[PDB]
Design an enzyme around this catalytic site. Structure first.
Site, PDB file in Angstrom:
ATOM      1  N   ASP A 124      98.808  22.463  41.314  1.00 31.73           N
ATOM      2  CA  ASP A 124      97.965  23.045  42.532  1.00 31.73           C
ATOM      3  C   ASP A 124      98.283  22.414  43.515  1.00 31.73           C
ATOM      4  OD1 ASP A 124      95.680  23.999  43.882  1.00 31.73           O
ATOM      5  OD2 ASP A 124      95.141  25.152  42.220  1.00 31.73           O
ATOM      6  N   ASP A 126      99.152  27.976  48.186  1.00 31.30           N
ATOM      7  CA  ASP A 126      98.321  27.601  47.081  1.00 31.30           C
ATOM      8  C   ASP A 126      98.959  27.879  45.650  1.00 31.30           C
ATOM      9  OD1 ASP A 126      96.541  26.635  45.100  1.00 31.30           O
ATOM     10  OD2 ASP A 126      94.786  27.862  45.990  1.00 31.30           O
TER      11      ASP A 126
HETATM   12  O1  LIG Z   1      90.663  28.567  41.132  1.00 33.93           O
HETATM   13  C1  LIG Z   1      91.466  27.875  40.633  1.00 33.93           C
HETATM   14  C2  LIG Z   1      91.971  26.652  42.023  1.00 33.93           C
HETATM   15  C3  LIG Z   1      91.457  25.406  42.210  1.00 33.93           C
HETATM   16  C4  LIG Z   1      90.699  24.738  41.254  1.00 33.93           C
HETATM   17  C5  LIG Z   1      90.860  23.659  41.093  1.00 33.93           C
HETATM   18  C6  LIG Z   1      90.267  22.626  40.159  1.00 33.93           C
HETATM   19  C7  LIG Z   1      88.904  23.176  39.586  1.00 33.93           C
HETATM   20  C8  LIG Z   1      88.262  22.379  38.813  1.00 33.93           C
HETATM   21  C9  LIG Z   1      88.309  22.433  37.335  1.00 33.93           C
HETATM   22  C10 LIG Z   1      89.500  23.261  36.589  1.00 33.93           C
HETATM   23  O2  LIG Z   1      89.792  22.367  35.456  1.00 33.93           O
HETATM   24  C11 LIG Z   1      90.053  23.409  34.441  1.00 33.93           C
HETATM   25  C12 LIG Z   1      90.689  24.526  34.693  1.00 33.93           C
HETATM   26  F1  LIG Z   1      91.022  24.889  35.839  1.00 33.93           F
HETATM   27  C13 LIG Z   1      90.854  25.429  33.406  1.00 33.93           C
HETATM   28  C14 LIG Z   1      90.412  24.897  32.378  1.00 33.93           C
HETATM   29  C15 LIG Z   1      89.777  23.918  32.166  1.00 33.93           C
HETATM   30  F2  LIG Z   1      89.283  23.600  30.887  1.00 33.93           F
HETATM   31  C16 LIG Z   1      89.359  22.996  32.925  1.00 33.93           C
HETATM   32 CL1  LIG Z   1      88.878  21.321  32.967  1.00 33.93          CL
HETATM   33  C17 LIG Z   1      88.865  24.528  39.996  1.00 33.93           C
HETATM   34  C18 LIG Z   1      89.450  25.210  40.481  1.00 33.93           C
HETATM   35  C19 LIG Z   1      91.782  24.737  43.543  1.00 33.93           C
HETATM   36  C20 LIG Z   1      92.659  25.747  44.492  1.00 33.93           C
HETATM   37  C21 LIG Z   1      91.801  26.276  45.357  1.00 33.93           C
HETATM   38  N1  LIG Z   1      91.213  27.341  44.825  1.00 33.93           N
HETATM   39  C22 LIG Z   1      91.844  28.314  43.996  1.00 33.93           C
HETATM   40  C23 LIG Z   1      92.688  27.614  43.046  1.00 33.93           C
HETATM   41  N2  LIG Z   1      93.557  26.589  43.680  1.00 33.93           N
HETATM   42  N3  LIG Z   1      91.782  27.414  39.527  1.00 33.93           N
HETATM   43  C24 LIG Z   1      91.147  28.319  38.453  1.00 33.93           C
HETATM   44  C25 LIG Z   1      91.971  29.416  37.931  1.00 33.93           C
HETATM   45  C26 LIG Z   1      92.920  29.955  38.785  1.00 33.93           C
HETATM   46  C27 LIG Z   1      93.669  31.238  38.229  1.00 33.93           C
HETATM   47  C28 LIG Z   1      93.433  31.560  36.960  1.00 33.93           C
HETATM   48  C29 LIG Z   1      92.415  30.728  36.198  1.00 33.93           C
HETATM   49 CL2  LIG Z   1      92.256  31.377  34.498  1.00 33.93          CL
HETATM   50  C30 LIG Z   1      91.821  29.551  36.570  1.00 33.93           C
HETATM   51 CL3  LIG Z   1      90.661  28.960  35.691  1.00 33.93          CL
HETATM   52  C31 LIG Z   1      92.744  26.372  39.210  1.00 33.93           C
HETATM   53  C32 LIG Z   1      93.881  26.549  38.220  1.00 33.93           C
HETATM   54  C33 LIG Z   1      94.168  26.112  39.531  1.00 33.93           C
END
Ligand SMILES: O=C(C1=C(c2ccc(CCCOc3c(F)ccc(F)c3Cl)cc2)C[C@@H]2CNC[C@H]1N2)N(Cc1cccc(Cl)c1Cl)C1CC1
Ligand SMILES: *[C@@H]1O[C@H](CO)[C@@H](O)[C@H](O)[C@H]1NC(C)=O
Length: 334
Positions: free
Chosen positions: A35, A219
């Site tokens: 990411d 991103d």
């Molecule tokens: O929304 C984000 C983003 C980011 C992000 C990064 C870290 C976190 C913290 C926790 C994520 O850890 C996860 C996970 F992403 C998914 C499942 C898990 F079990 C865990 Cl611990 C949340 C969001 C950072 C950055 C700016 N916002 C949009 C995006 N990129 N996501 C969540 C996401 C994006 C697209 C589809 C899905 Cl299903 C998800 Cl859950 C994470 C994948 C990149």
């Protein structure tokens, strides 16, 4: 050094592109998104209550099985849209395509069920800069640069269309087999974030939006192209698309005839045809088709801003250059 390291990605339904890492001794494997819009590594903790659905469905990191683990315990919080993701800091050895690095990462103990229970992957590896790192934790690619081993201080993404190779991330270079022609570069507005200036968005051949300039976050962890609620309203008026509660839709038979959309970045217009941004699940007039473009109000300091996610990255192979603080785009070969 003279090494590159590539990691195979899986494409889930064009919205999630993930690959493997291993953490600890012996290695505990996790599927992660790489990411560019974040700077922290996150995996779920074995300390996560089984009354979190996002934890139940995912692999959990257990420190009590790793011999190389080093306690820290500092609390970490991310205030996401649907609620808070929080956990604590731990250090262990992390492997990424044949590179091994001692890394501080967050172990998640709580998070919202949405969207996280829908994630086909377990965690996140933030490829952003120390400037945006929660707790100022040294990010993973910083610790790889410090090892001396990469051929170039760059990394690059290839995202395929759905069906086969789902995608590929290369550390230390690019893979020519996955793009054609040459890269065109744009300087970061400032180091700290993978964000560039965008000089215009066009529907068809006339410049519709972003007249006096705006910002584009690149991103890899975003599923879609996003803009502010008010820019997206205008784009979707211009496309003739209808606002649903969590997306925009067109009648499916209007899909193929929608205008080209163009992003003006550095010295090129990067063009997406309706084939690049419409989910053509049918060609019928009795059905509605979702668009791979969504509104997101991104909060300061990084926003307000557009985000160029996988919708954009699928068409244009992307190289992230830390040495020269720029982003290169090339047309992806599929
Ligand atoms: O929304 C984000 C983003 C980011 C992000 C990064 C870290 C976190 C913290 C926790 C994520 O850890 C996860 C996970 F992403 C998914 C499942 C898990 F079990 C865990 Cl611990 C949340 C969001 C950072 C950055 C700016 N916002 C949009 C995006 N990129 N996501 C969540 C996401 C994006 C697209 C589809 C899905 Cl299903 C998800 Cl859950 C994470 C994948 C990149
Ligand atoms: C955790 O690591 C951080 C580095 O950001 C350090 O400042 C902190 O003291 C560590 N926690 C402890 C007390 O081990």
């Amino acid at each position: 050094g003279n090494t590159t390291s590539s990691v195979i990605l899986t494409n889930y339904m064009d919205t999630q592109y993930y690959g493997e890492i291993g953490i600890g001794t012996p290695p505990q494997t996790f599927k992660v998104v790489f990411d560019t819009g974040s700077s922290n590594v996150w995996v779920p903790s074995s300390k996560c209550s089984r009354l979190y659905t996002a934890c139940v469905y995912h692999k959990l990191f257990d420190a009590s099985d790793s011999s190389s683990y080093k306690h820290n315990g500092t609390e970490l919080t991310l205030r996401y849209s649907t609620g808070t993701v929080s956990g604590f800091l731990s250090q262990d050895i992390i492997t990424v395509g044949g590179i091994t690095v001692t890394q501080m990462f967050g172990e998640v103990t709580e998070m919202p069920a949405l969207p996280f229970m829908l994630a086909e992957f377990d965690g996140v590896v933030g490829m952003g800069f120390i400037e945006q790192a929660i707790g100022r934790v040294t990010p993973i690619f910083d610790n790889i640069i410090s090892q001396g081993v990469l051929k170039e201080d760059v990394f690059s993404f290839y995202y395929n269309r759905d069906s086969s190779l789902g995608g590929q991330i290369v550390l230390g270079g690019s893979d020519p087999q996955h793009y054609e022609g040459n890269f065109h570069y744009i300087n970061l507005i400032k180091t700290g974030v993978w964000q560039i200036q965008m000089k215009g968005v066009s529907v068809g051949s006339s410049t519709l939006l972003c007249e006096d300039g705006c910002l584009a976050l690149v991103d890899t962890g975003a599923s879609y192209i996003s803009g502010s609620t008010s820019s997206i309203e205008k784009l979707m008026e211009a496309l003739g698309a209808k606002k649903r509660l969590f997306d925009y839709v067109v009648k499916c038979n209007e899909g193929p005839t929608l205008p080209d959309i163009s992003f003006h970045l550095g010295g090129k217009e990067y063009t997406l045809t309706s084939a690049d941004y419409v989910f053509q699940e049918s060609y019928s007039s009795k059905k509605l088709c979702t668009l791979a473009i969504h509104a997101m109000d991104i909060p300061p300091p990084t926003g307000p801003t557009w985000a160029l996610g996988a919708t954009f990255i699928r068409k244009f192979y992307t190289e992230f250059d830390r040495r020269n603080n720029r982003i290169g785009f090339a047309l992806a070969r599929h």
